[PDB]
Design a protein around this ligand. Sequence first.
Ligand code: FES
Ligand code: FES
Lengths: 120, 120
Amino acid sequence: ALLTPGEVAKRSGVAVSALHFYESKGLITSIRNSGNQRRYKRDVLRYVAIIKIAQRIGIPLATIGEAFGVTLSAKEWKQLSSQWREELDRRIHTLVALRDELDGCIGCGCLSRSDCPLRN
Amino acid sequence: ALLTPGEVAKRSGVAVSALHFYESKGLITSIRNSGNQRRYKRDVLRYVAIIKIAQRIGIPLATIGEAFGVTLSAKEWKQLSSQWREELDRRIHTLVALRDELDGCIGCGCLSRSDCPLRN
Ligand code: FES
Ligand code: FES
């Protein structure tokens, strides 16, 4: 039912301080009691789980909350999961693009401020 | 011959403070004079140029210096340029790999701590 900060932590593989962070950026929330004695809900593990994946996928921490704006059913996950992949892919290509800029420049070596793609 | 900090800056597109940084991490060097009146050498533009590309390629700032250990002739560039590309590529795939982990998990949505690749 209600998990202690230390519990969510040990079971989500992240420091308590992170749950704080993830709380400051308003990604997860708590329910104080008897002298602000905080606590979290079962599902919370699911979020942090998703949050990590998200970070691992390269999604900026902010854009996380934004997509966290639209019971974390596989239906919902389908969403964040996709928008994020599609995002990952966009990045993937940006590098593949840079990889190519490199490919050309290697044999060159002019590093011309004026014309070298790597330089622009 | 000798470029003022402000000159290397305006012509390399980076703040003077960066040349400082790039000097702290020992990537470029200066030649004080008449009351520590610093100054840089012609070639220095070339380095910073390379440094930026490097950063743009994703190469960690440290590993820059290390590869800066082995007249910046197209011969030399061939080196750093390659080791870096080869590096970029390795990264490129790591994501393509993650992209796939995602691809599978999307339709799922179990986010099982136990078995979900995205989770490990
Ligand atoms: S190094 Fe000459 S085109 Fe880039
Ligand atoms: S969400 Fe089920 S395998 Fe990853």
